Design a protein around this ligand. Sequence first.
Ligand SMILES: *Cc1c(COP(=O)(O)O)cnc(C)c1O
Ligand SMILES: *Cc1c(COP(=O)(O)O)cnc(C)c1O
Lengths: 384, 385
Amino acid sequence: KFTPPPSSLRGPLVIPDKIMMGPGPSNCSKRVLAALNNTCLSNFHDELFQVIDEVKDGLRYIFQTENRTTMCITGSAHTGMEALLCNLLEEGDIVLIANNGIWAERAINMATRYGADVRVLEGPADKPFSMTDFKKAIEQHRPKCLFVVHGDSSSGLLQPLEGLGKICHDYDCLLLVDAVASLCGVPFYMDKWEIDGVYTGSQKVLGAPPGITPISISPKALEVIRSRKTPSKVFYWDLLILGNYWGCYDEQKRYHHTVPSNLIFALREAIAQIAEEGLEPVIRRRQECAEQMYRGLQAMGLEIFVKDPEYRLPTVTCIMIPKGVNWWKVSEYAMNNFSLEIQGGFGPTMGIAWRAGIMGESSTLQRVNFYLYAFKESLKATHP
Amino acid sequence: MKFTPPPSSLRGPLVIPDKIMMGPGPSNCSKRVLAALNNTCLSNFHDELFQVIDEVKDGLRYIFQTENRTTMCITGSAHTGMEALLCNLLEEGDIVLIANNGIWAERAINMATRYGADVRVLEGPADKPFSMTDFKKAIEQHRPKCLFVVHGDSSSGLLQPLEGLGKICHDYDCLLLVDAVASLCGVPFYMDKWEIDGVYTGSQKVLGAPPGITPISISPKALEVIRSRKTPSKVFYWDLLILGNYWGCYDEQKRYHHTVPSNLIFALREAIAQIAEEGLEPVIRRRQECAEQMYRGLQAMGLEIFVKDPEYRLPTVTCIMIPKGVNWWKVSEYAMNNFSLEIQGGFGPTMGIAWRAGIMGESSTLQRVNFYLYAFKESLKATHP
Ligand SMILES: *Cc1c(COP(=O)(O)O)cnc(C)c1O
Ligand SMILES: *Cc1c(COP(=O)(O)O)cnc(C)c1O
């Protein structure tokens, strides 16, 4: 005797192809999606350990670090933010957060939740912080950790990082960076920029399925986690024990949790494509695409949230909605008529812009010209 | 740009062979379930994804057996189910009782300490379950906010009866929380009938779906406890009041929470559908029957089972006692190299003294059990004459 099954599961799974040029999930390649179609291996199968070691080598490549303490967390990229703050901060520890968009606000939320003394450097969403802004705020607050968003997908803002680590280190402070939307889209040098903790997202520039999160921490950062008098609040992403299974220490592997092998298979292959082509050509192609996007947008009389090109994040461009234009009518027509994802605004850009992403397989000149055409045609047909 | 160069290990191709997965480990997924992964990673606000989501919620209500509006998934492996229940329901200083006769309860003791709880333990041996008396005593003693039970223990091969337990817990104003990872769709389970306040399962165990997405459900009484909380829970990522918002469990406009793993949610949809098609009961009946055969064939090898009373065995995991002077690894190795069969070693209470045989996913067939039994046999003979 059971309550009978619902009728909503009687039909098939039907997902159409979409051209995914939000900042959202990106298009993954054929090679990457085929990698999902494999045995969900055991935690302790040799073939899985092999894939994990290759993935760690690949992450040290795309992060540009020698950090042994390089792994994935099982979850979305939020998970990276959670783990850096959860692990590195005890009750009362002072964290400084540079806030000019919604991802800082998330970080402010979590750090309060883990019981930290949160200090906030506030700024306008459309301009970056100067080294002078950071120095004063570190002097004032004398924080254990600084948290900074590198590429803000909610603004289209790229925060320059050259020298912030030296400054952080002069004041005995760890430097933590979100590189979810920035990595493989612009130059990034974890070690030379003296970053003590970074994470990215599988579904942004890498063009891999969501659900698995690259993370890396510095020897200094490992040392602070080892020093803690109190245990971190979450077993699931305690980096001393997750690190163990990921074979980051001089220890026998122990079962911690069941890793999403299929997702990890897809991530290996995604890194492989970037290694094959080379990190520098991949970044340049994304840079060239963004130039083309700016040229086309200029030709159409449309503006960009971040006015100063120097400080624009190439992978996410926030296109301003002109007076008299309904944004959702454009987005809805594009999807319905071209299968194009033209995503609305978010955080500081809510209500005032669309977000145009150049990530994964949509990082080509041909995809950029189809975006502006479809966008243009979607305006005209919804506003005459 | 002068980047450190890429590693040569990425130069070659990915090669993941087919394996028969009859550990408790991950299971074999059907063709249909794996194919589902191969689809567009959708936006969090695409109608199509919202549709699949509603179908996952309907199908979860089915296999959990509940009308709970607060049914959803956590993005993560099943440990996330244990995290989120303890995390959401326990404030600094609240009192939690944890029935402990296995490694999954040790994990729950580890998590609950970290979250700042007053942890009480009811200890007991791994190879027999708790009486309703045993619970009732423990519940009087400690008068706790929540009790936490493992329904199906993949470390032992033990199944814990639950009929009655709900009404006892509620009498003392205590919530009942259950781990149904290794038991859901393997044995009967009635979330509402049995007055359960919190359950989760795993995608990779009985359902035969890929790991990474974790179904969870909480009662209207549990929801009210969380809303009553005097402090905010410690983890935004699995705060059910806001995760629950995106999954459309509440009378609020949907807000973005996190990027859900659309591909794993699609595979989960299909896995639930496979079970809906044949029907819950036939599916459970087939797995019971498979276990029966497994016991009869183990009996005919003169091998023993950690959990001695059949009335207390979990059919989905059977721990097979290593005979004295038998090298377990030499068996398991030969099983893998000659048959591509996973014969998993022991873990927790059963480490050093068992293999663990699983009847899960697409290996839940007579034909596959009969294959395990044959391959085990040949493996022993060839490595221990
Ligand atoms: C998308 C994004 C996140 C959140 O990651 P999810 O996988 O969506 O949970 C965090 N930080 C930045 C910069 C992002 O672009
Ligand atoms: C395997 C298992 C877990 C752990 O789940 P993961 O998906 O590996 O994180 C928890 N509980 C039970 C009963 C299990 O069998």
